[PDB]
Write a protein that binds this ligand. Structure first.
Ligand SMILES: CCCCCCCCCC(=O)N(CCO)C[C@@H](O)[C@@H](O)[C@@H](O)[C@@H](O)CO
Ligand SMILES: CCCCCCCCCC(=O)N(CCO)C[C@@H](O)[C@@H](O)[C@@H](O)[C@@H](O)CO
Ligand SMILES: CCCCCCCCCC(=O)N(CCO)C[C@@H](O)[C@@H](O)[C@@H](O)[C@@H](O)CO
Ligand SMILES: CCCCCCCCCC(=O)N(CCO)C[C@@H](O)[C@@H](O)[C@@H](O)[C@@H](O)CO
Ligand code: NA
Ligand code: NA
Lengths: 90, 92, 90, 92
């Protein structure tokens, strides 16, 4: 359970280190520094306006941005569910 | 489990083949080619602005578009949940 | 399981018969007829722009509209989850 | 089960007492009184436009507003899921 959380935080930090680098210069209010990234990736992970509000405007400059966001969503949303179930079982 | 994923990908491809054909010419930014469709249907499956952002504008041109999106939502959202639970069970 | 679905459809029809009557004349594109209502209540049940997009503009004319939408959300979202789990178990 | 609901209502009231105080004067339509707060925190708990619609505009005046909303989300969303599962188990 704590092991699941450990994976998720490593993933969340690596995702935010990558996101800062990729879309930081072009989208500063969303990924203009590691912290700005960690917030936006938490927002993306919750699915609040992930596509219409973030990923589509991102794709208008970086057309393949989907190769990073969609897998990230698939991976982080599975982990969160897995974790939340793990606490409930334990 | 892998069988559940196999169903979902077939559904996802058939849904995107259908969606391209139906609302492609009228809504090119959303379904203007199989890939554009696969992205928008993933977005619809996650429920991000499915109605206010996609389905309602689509219905303003195709008033019965709901006969395709609502069942798709019902089917894909059930499958994803069923799949995610299936992995969790098959690990215990 | 089929019993759960039966409850939900009765609730969904009564909710749409009530919604048509309450906010139909004031918000025709959302509840201007039983079918328009059934669509918007499905949208509300999925939580797509339920508050910012629907319930807040509804409350600007009917300030207590929350006494209908919030319980409806609580009830329908519980039922859907209960149903989806029921199919998975059976 | 009823104990889980009891925790959530205490949390929900304390969160709305805090939220009223913090962002009430600056964002009156959202937290301008305990009731306005309880509605917006329910909306945040459901995740409807939590960030783009609420938290980001809030952060433009209070840059650390995230220290309150993100933990609240983490805590309330876990509780609701835990509660909904608890009813389902206590019926079997
Ligand atoms: C696993 C969940 C991880 C959640 C991570 C939250 C990070 C929040 C990011 C953040 O602190 N800011 C960026 C977003 O505005 C604001 C700051 O930059 C500012 O307050 C001081 O600097
Ligand atoms: C499971 C569902 C997976 C869905 C993946 C869809 C990917 C769609 C896509 O690649 N594009 C359409 C959306 O813009 C962008 C391309 O057109 C662009 O990369 C070429 O340039
Ligand atoms: C339990 C799930 C229930 C889902 C119910 C879906 C109802 C869809 C409503 C609907 O058909 N329309 C209203 C929304 O536009 C369009 C029609 O009015 C028009 O096509 C013919 O009339
Ligand atoms: C569990 C969470 C329950 C939350 C219920 C909040 C209800 C808030 C509310 O009643 N209003 C604030 C939102 O507008 C409207 C009133 O101000 C209006 O009815 C008086 O007129
Ligand atoms: Na949403
Ligand atoms: Na959601």
């Amino acid at each position: 359970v704590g092991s699941v959380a450990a994976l998720l935080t490593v993933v969340f930090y690596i995702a935010a280190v990558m996101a800062t680098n990729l879309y930081g210069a072009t989208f500063p209010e969303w990924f203009g520094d590691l912290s700005k990234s960690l917030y936006t990736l938490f927002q993306v992970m919750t699915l609040d306006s992930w596509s219409m509000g973030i990923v589509r405007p991102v794709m208008n400059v970086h057309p393949n941005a989907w190769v990073f966001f969609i897998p990230f969503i698939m991976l982080t949303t599975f982990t969160v569910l897995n974790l939340f179930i793990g606490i409930i079982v334990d």
